[PDB]
Structure formats: structure tokens, C-alpha cells
Amino acid sequence: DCHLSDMLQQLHSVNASKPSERGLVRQEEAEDPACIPIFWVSKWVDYSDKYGLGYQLCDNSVGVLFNDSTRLILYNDGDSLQYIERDGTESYLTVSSHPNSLMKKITLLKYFRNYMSEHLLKAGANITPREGDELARLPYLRTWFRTRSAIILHLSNGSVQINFFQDHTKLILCPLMAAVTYIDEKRDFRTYRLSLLEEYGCCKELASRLRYARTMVDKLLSSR
Amino acid sequence: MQSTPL
């Protein structure tokens, strides 16, 4: 589908332009709040040792990527489900309609959702998401991993999100908008167009985060 | 492992 290849290309162009080594960095000029994401990962729990990775999207929907490479998504209505098999095949169900084969997986998903509500902060709680574009589809988590510095989450709409552990800063990259939103140590959020970062530059801190994102994106590519 | 707590 080309999303990751496109993202790698956008990050290579911006990083090749050396955005922190300019006479006058004017990061604020690259700002475009029109490109705020529809979706990002708000919370997560890694129980990969035997259940899977659970997460919450900013619209209060929840999902799990189970150890058997399957996924299950609960919409924010609390009932509408989407199940996705190993090879991408998608079924649409309800928790009311009770296919016995998924009751254990649904039980687990509900435990994850309860766990996240009771114990975990909502990243980007102070962000109004962009309105989705017409028959707007809920994404699921394609791939994820974590290093020592960060967790890297690749959603099915092409966006990748990198949450750094040390300082709690967060990047969300969208290859469709060709944008990056940066969430600061103080939870301050800005969305930037990658083409304008090329033109105007950005501080060292974001420059390093974007260099790290390219290598993370190459890694995501190498799994393929 | 966990995301940031309340």
C-alpha cells in the first residue's frame, strides 16, 4: 500500500536537509493544526508474555493485538467489534451477538479496557482530534515493538507513533498528511508539515526525534 | 510493561 515507503521518503528528505543546522530556525512557521491526526494511541499495556498488547485510541475505542497475530477492536459505542485474522481478513460483529469462538478474546479485551481506565493517563487528552473524512474507518494496530528508549506503534491507516520513555515525549507521523505531531515533556502538542520543517527548520530536540523515527521506520520496513 | 499511569 506504500504508506511506510512514503513515510521513509518524507523523513529522508527532511532529515537530509539537516533541519536543526540553519541560520534561523522558525519551527513555528511549519505549524499546521489542520493536519492534526484523527487517531493516536492514548494508552497501552504490554502483556505480550501471554495475552498480547492492549491499547486505547484517542476516541476511547480500544484494541488488542494478540499473540496469535490476530486483533480485536471495540468501537467507542461499547458493542461494535471488528475482528481481524492473521491474513488481514475482517469481520464485523457485536458483543451482543455472541459468537462463542471469540468470547475469551472479548473477555480479555474488556479486561484491558478496564485496566486502562482505572490505571492510566490519556495521552493527548488536551487535543481535539481532526474530524475524519467521510465513512471514516477505525484503524487497528498492524505492528509494534519496543527498544529501550521507546515504543513504536504502526496503525493500519499508515500512521506510526513513537512514545519515548525517558521524558514522556511522543511523535505521531502521518504519511497521508505528510505531517508529524510532537508532544512535549510538558504535554504541549504541535502538528507540523514535514515539507515546511524542511523549509524553516526545527530545534535540535525534534531533529533528533525525526532521525530516530527514520531508523525506526526502516526497521518496520525490514519486517517485510 | 505499561504506558504512563494516573
Short mmCIF file of N, CA, C and O in Angstrom, two decimals, chain A residues 87-178:
data_model
loop_
_atom_site.label_atom_id
_atom_site.label_comp_id
_atom_site.label_asym_id
_atom_site.label_seq_id
_atom_site.Cartn_x
_atom_site.Cartn_y
_atom_site.Cartn_z
N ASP A 87 -4.23 -12.96 8.20
CA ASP A 87 -4.01 -12.50 6.82
C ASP A 87 -4.85 -11.28 6.42
O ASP A 87 -5.16 -11.08 5.23
N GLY A 88 -5.22 -10.47 7.41
CA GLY A 88 -5.90 -9.21 7.17
C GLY A 88 -7.41 -9.25 7.04
O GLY A 88 -8.03 -8.19 6.99
N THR A 89 -8.00 -10.45 7.01
CA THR A 89 -9.44 -10.67 6.81
C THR A 89 -10.27 -10.09 7.96
O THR A 89 -10.00 -10.38 9.10
N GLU A 90 -11.31 -9.32 7.63
CA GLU A 90 -12.03 -8.50 8.61
C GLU A 90 -13.50 -8.89 8.74
O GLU A 90 -14.22 -8.89 7.75
N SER A 91 -13.93 -9.24 9.95
CA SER A 91 -15.33 -9.50 10.26
C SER A 91 -15.84 -8.43 11.22
O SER A 91 -15.09 -7.97 12.07
N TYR A 92 -17.11 -8.05 11.08
CA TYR A 92 -17.73 -7.02 11.89
C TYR A 92 -18.82 -7.69 12.72
O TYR A 92 -19.71 -8.33 12.18
N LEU A 93 -18.72 -7.59 14.04
CA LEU A 93 -19.61 -8.30 14.96
C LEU A 93 -20.11 -7.37 16.07
O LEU A 93 -19.80 -6.18 16.08
N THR A 94 -20.90 -7.90 17.00
CA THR A 94 -21.22 -7.16 18.22
C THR A 94 -20.95 -8.00 19.44
O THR A 94 -20.93 -9.21 19.36
N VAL A 95 -20.74 -7.35 20.57
CA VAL A 95 -20.63 -8.07 21.83
C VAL A 95 -22.00 -8.66 22.21
O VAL A 95 -22.06 -9.64 22.96
N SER A 96 -23.08 -8.07 21.70
CA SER A 96 -24.43 -8.59 21.92
C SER A 96 -24.61 -9.93 21.19
O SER A 96 -24.98 -10.93 21.80
N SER A 97 -24.33 -9.94 19.88
CA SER A 97 -24.21 -11.18 19.12
C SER A 97 -23.00 -11.91 19.65
O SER A 97 -21.91 -11.35 19.73
N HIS A 98 -23.17 -13.17 19.98
CA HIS A 98 -22.25 -13.82 20.90
C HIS A 98 -21.61 -15.03 20.25
O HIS A 98 -21.90 -16.16 20.66
N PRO A 99 -20.77 -14.82 19.22
CA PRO A 99 -20.00 -15.93 18.63
C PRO A 99 -19.07 -16.51 19.67
O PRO A 99 -18.15 -15.85 20.10
N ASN A 100 -19.35 -17.75 20.06
CA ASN A 100 -18.67 -18.41 21.16
C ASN A 100 -17.16 -18.44 21.01
O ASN A 100 -16.43 -18.37 21.99
N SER A 101 -16.69 -18.59 19.77
CA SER A 101 -15.27 -18.68 19.47
C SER A 101 -14.44 -17.46 19.90
O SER A 101 -13.23 -17.57 20.01
N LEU A 102 -15.08 -16.30 20.08
CA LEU A 102 -14.40 -15.05 20.43
C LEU A 102 -14.68 -14.58 21.86
O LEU A 102 -14.17 -13.55 22.26
N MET A 103 -15.49 -15.30 22.62
CA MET A 103 -15.85 -14.87 23.98
C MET A 103 -14.63 -14.69 24.89
O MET A 103 -14.61 -13.78 25.72
N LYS A 104 -13.64 -15.56 24.75
CA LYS A 104 -12.43 -15.45 25.55
C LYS A 104 -11.65 -14.21 25.09
O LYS A 104 -11.24 -13.39 25.92
N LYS A 105 -11.50 -14.04 23.78
CA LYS A 105 -10.81 -12.87 23.27
C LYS A 105 -11.53 -11.56 23.65
O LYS A 105 -10.86 -10.58 23.97
N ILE A 106 -12.86 -11.57 23.66
CA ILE A 106 -13.65 -10.39 24.05
C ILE A 106 -13.50 -10.15 25.57
O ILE A 106 -13.43 -9.01 26.02
N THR A 107 -13.41 -11.22 26.34
CA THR A 107 -13.25 -11.10 27.79
C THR A 107 -11.94 -10.42 28.12
O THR A 107 -11.91 -9.47 28.90
N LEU A 108 -10.86 -10.90 27.51
CA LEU A 108 -9.55 -10.28 27.59
C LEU A 108 -9.55 -8.81 27.20
O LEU A 108 -8.94 -8.00 27.89
N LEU A 109 -10.21 -8.47 26.10
CA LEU A 109 -10.26 -7.08 25.61
C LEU A 109 -10.95 -6.18 26.63
O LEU A 109 -10.55 -5.03 26.84
N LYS A 110 -11.98 -6.70 27.27
CA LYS A 110 -12.72 -5.95 28.26
C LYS A 110 -11.84 -5.78 29.51
O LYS A 110 -11.86 -4.73 30.11
N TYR A 111 -11.05 -6.79 29.87
CA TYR A 111 -10.13 -6.63 31.00
C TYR A 111 -9.09 -5.57 30.70
O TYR A 111 -8.76 -4.82 31.58
N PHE A 112 -8.58 -5.53 29.47
CA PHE A 112 -7.62 -4.49 29.07
C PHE A 112 -8.25 -3.11 29.16
O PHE A 112 -7.67 -2.17 29.69
N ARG A 113 -9.44 -2.97 28.62
CA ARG A 113 -10.14 -1.68 28.68
C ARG A 113 -10.39 -1.21 30.13
O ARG A 113 -10.17 -0.07 30.45
N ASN A 114 -10.81 -2.12 31.00
CA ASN A 114 -10.98 -1.81 32.42
C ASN A 114 -9.64 -1.41 33.05
O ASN A 114 -9.56 -0.47 33.85
N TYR A 115 -8.60 -2.13 32.68
CA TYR A 115 -7.30 -1.87 33.24
C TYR A 115 -6.80 -0.47 32.90
O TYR A 115 -6.30 0.24 33.77
N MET A 116 -7.00 -0.07 31.64
CA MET A 116 -6.54 1.22 31.13
C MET A 116 -7.32 2.40 31.72
O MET A 116 -6.75 3.46 31.95
N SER A 117 -8.62 2.20 31.95
CA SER A 117 -9.48 3.23 32.55
C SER A 117 -9.14 3.50 33.99
O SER A 117 -9.16 4.64 34.44
N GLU A 118 -8.81 2.44 34.70
CA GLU A 118 -8.57 2.53 36.13
C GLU A 118 -7.17 3.05 36.45
O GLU A 118 -6.97 3.67 37.49
N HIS A 119 -6.20 2.78 35.57
CA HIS A 119 -4.80 2.94 35.97
C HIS A 119 -3.97 3.92 35.13
O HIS A 119 -2.88 4.28 35.55
N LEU A 120 -4.45 4.35 33.97
CA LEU A 120 -3.55 5.02 33.01
C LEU A 120 -4.04 6.33 32.43
O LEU A 120 -5.19 6.45 32.02
N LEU A 121 -3.14 7.30 32.38
CA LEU A 121 -3.40 8.62 31.78
C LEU A 121 -3.64 8.55 30.27
O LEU A 121 -3.01 7.77 29.59
N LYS A 122 -4.50 9.44 29.79
CA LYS A 122 -4.83 9.62 28.39
C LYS A 122 -3.83 10.58 27.72
O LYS A 122 -3.90 11.78 27.95
N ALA A 123 -2.92 10.08 26.88
CA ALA A 123 -2.04 10.98 26.14
C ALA A 123 -2.89 11.81 25.20
O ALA A 123 -3.86 11.32 24.64
N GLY A 124 -2.53 13.07 25.06
CA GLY A 124 -3.22 13.98 24.17
C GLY A 124 -4.66 14.28 24.56
O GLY A 124 -5.49 14.61 23.70
N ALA A 125 -4.94 14.17 25.85
CA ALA A 125 -6.25 14.48 26.41
C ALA A 125 -6.67 15.91 26.08
O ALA A 125 -7.85 16.19 25.94
N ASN A 126 -5.69 16.80 25.97
CA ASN A 126 -5.92 18.18 25.54
C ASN A 126 -5.69 18.37 24.04
O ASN A 126 -5.06 19.33 23.62
N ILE A 127 -6.19 17.44 23.22
CA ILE A 127 -6.13 17.63 21.78
C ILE A 127 -7.52 17.35 21.23
O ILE A 127 -8.14 16.36 21.56
N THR A 128 -8.02 18.25 20.42
CA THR A 128 -9.26 17.97 19.71
C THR A 128 -8.83 17.27 18.46
O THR A 128 -8.11 17.86 17.69
N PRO A 129 -9.21 16.00 18.27
CA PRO A 129 -8.85 15.30 17.02
C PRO A 129 -9.52 15.95 15.83
O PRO A 129 -10.56 16.58 15.96
N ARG A 130 -8.89 15.82 14.69
CA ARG A 130 -9.47 16.27 13.45
C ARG A 130 -10.69 15.40 13.14
O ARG A 130 -10.69 14.20 13.43
N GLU A 131 -11.72 16.02 12.56
CA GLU A 131 -12.86 15.27 12.05
C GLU A 131 -12.41 14.36 10.89
O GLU A 131 -11.70 14.79 9.98
N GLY A 132 -12.81 13.10 10.95
CA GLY A 132 -12.48 12.13 9.91
C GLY A 132 -13.15 12.42 8.59
O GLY A 132 -14.19 13.08 8.55
N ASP A 133 -12.55 11.93 7.51
CA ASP A 133 -13.01 12.22 6.15
C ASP A 133 -13.93 11.12 5.58
O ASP A 133 -13.46 10.23 4.87
N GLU A 134 -15.22 11.20 5.92
CA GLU A 134 -16.31 10.55 5.16
C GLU A 134 -16.22 9.02 5.10
O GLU A 134 -15.32 8.48 4.47
N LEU A 135 -17.18 8.35 5.73
CA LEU A 135 -17.05 6.93 6.03
C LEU A 135 -15.67 6.66 6.63
O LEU A 135 -14.92 5.79 6.15
N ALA A 136 -15.34 7.43 7.67
CA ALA A 136 -14.03 7.35 8.33
C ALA A 136 -13.86 5.99 9.04
O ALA A 136 -14.66 5.66 9.91
N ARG A 137 -12.84 5.23 8.66
CA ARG A 137 -12.63 3.88 9.18
C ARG A 137 -11.76 3.86 10.46
O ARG A 137 -10.73 4.51 10.52
N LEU A 138 -12.18 3.08 11.45
CA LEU A 138 -11.34 2.80 12.62
C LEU A 138 -10.12 1.95 12.24
O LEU A 138 -10.27 0.88 11.64
N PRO A 139 -8.91 2.41 12.55
CA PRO A 139 -7.71 1.60 12.35
C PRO A 139 -7.47 0.61 13.49
O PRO A 139 -8.08 0.67 14.55
N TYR A 140 -6.61 -0.35 13.20
CA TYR A 140 -6.18 -1.35 14.15
C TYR A 140 -4.69 -1.28 14.12
O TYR A 140 -4.11 -0.63 13.22
N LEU A 141 -4.07 -1.94 15.10
CA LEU A 141 -2.62 -1.93 15.23
C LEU A 141 -2.02 -3.02 14.36
O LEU A 141 -2.20 -4.20 14.65
N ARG A 142 -1.29 -2.63 13.31
CA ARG A 142 -0.62 -3.58 12.43
C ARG A 142 0.58 -4.23 13.12
O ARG A 142 0.63 -5.45 13.29
N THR A 143 1.55 -3.41 13.48
CA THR A 143 2.76 -3.86 14.14
C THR A 143 3.15 -2.94 15.28
O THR A 143 2.87 -1.75 15.25
N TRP A 144 3.87 -3.50 16.25
CA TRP A 144 4.50 -2.72 17.30
C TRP A 144 5.74 -3.40 17.83
O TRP A 144 5.89 -4.61 17.70
N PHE A 145 6.63 -2.62 18.46
CA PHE A 145 7.73 -3.16 19.25
C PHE A 145 8.30 -2.13 20.20
O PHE A 145 8.04 -0.94 20.06
N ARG A 146 9.10 -2.55 21.16
CA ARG A 146 9.83 -1.57 21.95
C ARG A 146 11.30 -1.90 22.17
O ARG A 146 11.68 -3.05 22.24
N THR A 147 12.09 -0.84 22.26
CA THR A 147 13.55 -0.93 22.24
C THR A 147 14.10 -0.86 23.68
O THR A 147 14.04 -1.84 24.43
N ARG A 148 14.70 0.26 24.06
CA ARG A 148 14.97 0.54 25.47
C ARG A 148 14.53 1.97 25.74
O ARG A 148 14.25 2.35 26.87
N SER A 149 14.43 2.73 24.66
CA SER A 149 14.10 4.13 24.68
C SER A 149 12.65 4.39 24.39
O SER A 149 12.14 5.41 24.79
N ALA A 150 11.98 3.49 23.67
CA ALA A 150 10.69 3.83 23.10
C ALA A 150 9.83 2.66 22.71
O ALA A 150 10.30 1.53 22.57
N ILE A 151 8.56 2.96 22.54
CA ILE A 151 7.63 2.06 21.90
C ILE A 151 7.17 2.68 20.58
O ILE A 151 6.99 3.89 20.48
N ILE A 152 7.01 1.82 19.59
CA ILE A 152 6.79 2.14 18.20
C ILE A 152 5.54 1.36 17.78
O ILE A 152 5.50 0.14 17.90
N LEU A 153 4.53 2.09 17.32
CA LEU A 153 3.19 1.56 17.05
C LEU A 153 2.77 1.96 15.64
O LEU A 153 2.70 3.13 15.36
N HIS A 154 2.50 0.99 14.77
CA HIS A 154 2.21 1.24 13.34
C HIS A 154 0.75 0.93 13.14
O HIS A 154 0.39 -0.22 13.24
N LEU A 155 -0.08 1.93 12.89
CA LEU A 155 -1.53 1.72 12.73
C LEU A 155 -1.88 1.43 11.28
O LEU A 155 -1.12 1.78 10.38
N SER A 156 -3.06 0.87 11.05
CA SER A 156 -3.42 0.33 9.72
C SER A 156 -3.71 1.45 8.74
O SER A 156 -3.72 1.23 7.54
N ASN A 157 -3.89 2.66 9.24
CA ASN A 157 -4.08 3.81 8.35
C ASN A 157 -2.77 4.40 7.89
O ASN A 157 -2.77 5.45 7.27
N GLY A 158 -1.65 3.75 8.20
CA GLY A 158 -0.33 4.23 7.81
C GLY A 158 0.47 5.06 8.83
O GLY A 158 1.70 5.20 8.71
N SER A 159 -0.21 5.61 9.82
CA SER A 159 0.46 6.43 10.78
C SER A 159 1.33 5.58 11.73
O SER A 159 1.01 4.41 12.03
N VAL A 160 2.49 6.10 12.10
CA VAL A 160 3.28 5.47 13.15
C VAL A 160 3.51 6.45 14.32
O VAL A 160 3.70 7.64 14.14
N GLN A 161 3.42 5.92 15.53
CA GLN A 161 3.55 6.70 16.76
C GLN A 161 4.71 6.14 17.57
O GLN A 161 4.86 4.93 17.69
N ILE A 162 5.58 7.02 18.04
CA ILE A 162 6.73 6.66 18.84
C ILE A 162 6.64 7.43 20.20
O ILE A 162 6.65 8.64 20.23
N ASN A 163 6.55 6.69 21.30
CA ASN A 163 6.46 7.23 22.65
C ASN A 163 7.82 6.94 23.30
O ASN A 163 8.22 5.78 23.43
N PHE A 164 8.52 8.00 23.67
CA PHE A 164 9.79 7.87 24.35
C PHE A 164 9.59 7.78 25.87
O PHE A 164 8.85 8.57 26.44
N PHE A 165 10.23 6.80 26.48
CA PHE A 165 10.05 6.51 27.91
C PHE A 165 10.69 7.53 28.86
O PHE A 165 10.07 7.96 29.81
N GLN A 166 11.95 7.87 28.61
CA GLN A 166 12.70 8.76 29.49
C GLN A 166 11.82 9.97 29.83
O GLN A 166 11.34 10.11 30.95
N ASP A 167 11.58 10.81 28.83
CA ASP A 167 10.95 12.12 29.04
C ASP A 167 9.45 12.20 28.69
O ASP A 167 8.87 13.28 28.69
N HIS A 168 8.83 11.06 28.39
CA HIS A 168 7.42 11.03 28.00
C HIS A 168 7.04 11.84 26.77
O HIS A 168 5.87 12.15 26.60
N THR A 169 7.99 12.23 25.93
CA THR A 169 7.65 12.91 24.67
C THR A 169 7.16 11.89 23.65
O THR A 169 7.44 10.73 23.77
N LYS A 170 6.43 12.36 22.64
CA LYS A 170 5.70 11.50 21.71
C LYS A 170 5.62 12.14 20.33
O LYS A 170 5.31 13.32 20.20
N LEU A 171 5.88 11.33 19.31
CA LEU A 171 5.73 11.71 17.91
C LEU A 171 4.56 10.90 17.29
O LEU A 171 4.41 9.73 17.58
N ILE A 172 3.77 11.54 16.43
CA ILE A 172 2.79 10.84 15.60
C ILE A 172 2.99 11.26 14.15
O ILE A 172 2.82 12.42 13.81
N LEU A 173 3.34 10.30 13.30
CA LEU A 173 3.66 10.57 11.90
C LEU A 173 2.52 10.07 10.99
O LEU A 173 2.03 8.95 11.17
N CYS A 174 2.10 10.92 10.08
CA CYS A 174 1.06 10.59 9.11
C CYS A 174 1.59 10.76 7.71
O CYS A 174 1.81 11.88 7.27
N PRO A 175 1.76 9.67 6.99
CA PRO A 175 2.24 9.74 5.61
C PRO A 175 1.20 10.32 4.64
O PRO A 175 1.62 10.77 3.61
N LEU A 176 -0.09 10.37 5.00
CA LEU A 176 -1.11 10.96 4.14
C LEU A 176 -1.08 12.49 4.18
O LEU A 176 -1.09 13.15 3.14
N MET A 177 -1.00 13.04 5.39
CA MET A 177 -0.78 14.47 5.59
C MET A 177 0.66 14.89 5.40
O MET A 177 0.96 16.09 5.36
N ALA A 178 1.56 13.90 5.32
CA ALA A 178 3.00 14.18 5.40
C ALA A 178 3.28 15.14 6.58
O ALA A 178 3.88 16.19 6.41
#
